[PDB]
């Protein structure tokens, strides 16, 4: 079984969506009428920008400590989503983060893919520093935040309270996280404020047979879902 | 002009076609010294949070013979105001024909509390220069009026009035 998914002009291949997690069991959804207002006015461009965007692949090695991305930050140079994210002032969007990872049967290791709401990292006081964009940042084992603390002084073993998946190479080699819009507000600035944060840390480290490929690829494919923004909506009276 | 009768009149005249706006009004009804002391702004100063729409209404007070066009542009929040007529036209705008309608109304929707420059802009540009028939004066005045809509909402009273 091999499921080929098309969004817009963009096509990806998934071995199977057999174990695809939905954070808090809540699927992405537009701003409902009970929480909307015809005078605080949204529009829905979930036509074109809401497609699969595939970041530049990262290379998992024996020495890799982890990687992280912020959202909608990572997609701030990604075509129409990045355009809308700057043209519009207020926006909301869920995501579908499909972390594929390509390894042989003679590689071994495990990744913990964690989706974090309000992933405030720390050695933080800098926008460019806290928002690396498309390439994301990396963790450490001692700026760059600490592996076992997630940066936020926080034992990684408890990280599984967050929405997550485990990519254990002997079993599954891909993970999917369906993230709804999570914020204290129904809608907010995308450029000033990242709602979600992806963090991929090797729980079990990479290892492999003698002369296998030394560094395997982890690929992220992020699809905005139910992307909606403001709000140019003017009434001209006679 | 301030604290006079002339502080209420935007004068249109005949001068080189600089696409600088006739006016560019920022939509901070609580903190903008123009909109601040309007009745709307006076009430908003009594409250901490507020949200709704503002209808602005420009009224032409020239001759019945005068003819021309103005461009009333609306820049949403987060967008810096347009500096030229083309930038204004490619955005949200109303071409107001003076000879046909003496007023132009524009309802701006995304007005909310400052804190505790954003909100947007209402700009006015010359699309055309004003055409008069004879020795009719080539110096007119447009007035402007602002109000909240029925939807508009305030809350958490903050009377701050001392000496």
């Amino acid at each position: 079984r091999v499921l080929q998914l098309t969004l817009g002009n963009s096509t990806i291949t998934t071995q199977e969506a057999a174990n695809s997690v939905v954070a808090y069991g809540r699927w992405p959804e537009y701003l409902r009428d009970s929480e909307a207002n015809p005078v605080d006015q949204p529009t829905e461009p979930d036509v074109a920008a809401c497609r699969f965007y595939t970041l530049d692949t990262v290379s998992w090695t024996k020495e890799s400590r982890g990687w992280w991305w912020k959202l909608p930050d990572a997609l701030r140079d990604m075509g129409l989503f990045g355009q809308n994210m700057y043209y519009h002032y207020l926006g909301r969007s869920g995501y579908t983060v499909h972390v594929q990872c390509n390894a042989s049967k003679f590689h071994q290791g495990a990744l913990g893919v964690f989706a974090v709401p309000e992933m405030c990292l720390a050695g933080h006081t800098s926008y460019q520093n806290a928002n690396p964009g498309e390439k994301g940042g990396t963790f450490t084992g001692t700026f760059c935040p600490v592996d076992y603390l997630l940066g936020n002084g926080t034992l990684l073993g408890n990280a599984f309270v967050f929405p997550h998946q485990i990519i254990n190479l002997r079993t599954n080699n891909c993970a999917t996280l369906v993230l709804p819009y999570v914020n204290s507000l129904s809608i907010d600035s995308m450029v000033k404020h990242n709602n979600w944060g992806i963090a991929i840390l090797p729980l079990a480290p990479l290892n492999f047979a003698s002369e296998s490929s030394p560094e395997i690829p982890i690929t992220l494919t992020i699809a905005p879902m139910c992307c909606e923004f403001n709000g140019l909506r003017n009434i001209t009276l006679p | 002009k301030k604290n006079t009768m002339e502080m209420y009149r935007v004068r249109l005249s005949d001068k080189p076609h600089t696409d600088d706006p006739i006016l560019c009004l920022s939509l901070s009804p609580a903190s903008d010294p123009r909109l601040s002391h309007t009745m709307l702004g006076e009430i908003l100063n009594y409250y901490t949070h507020w949200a709704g729409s503002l209808k602005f209404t420009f009224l032409f007070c020239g001759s019945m013979m005068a003819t021309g066009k103005l461009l009333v542009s609306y820049a949403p929040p987060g967008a810096d105001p347009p500096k030229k007529r083309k930038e204004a036209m490619l955005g949200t705008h109303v071409i107001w024909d003076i000879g046909l309608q003496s007023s132009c109304t524009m309802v701006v929707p995304w007005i909310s509390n400052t804190t505790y420059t954003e909100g947007g802009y209402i700009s006015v540009f010359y699309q055309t220069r004003i055409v008069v028939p004879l020795s009719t004066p080539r110096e007119m005045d447009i007035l402007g009026f602002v109000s909240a809509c029925n939807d508009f909402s305030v809350r958490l009273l903050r009377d701050t009035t001392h000496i």
């Binding site: 909307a36 207002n37 507000l185 | 409250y47 949070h49 305030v154 809350r155």
Partner: peptide, 13 residues
């Protein structure tokens, strides 16, 4: 800060 607010005029009574 920029929050969606429903109609509420009770405190302006």
């Amino acid at each position: 800060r920029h929050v969606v607010q429903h109609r509420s005029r009770s405190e302006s009574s």
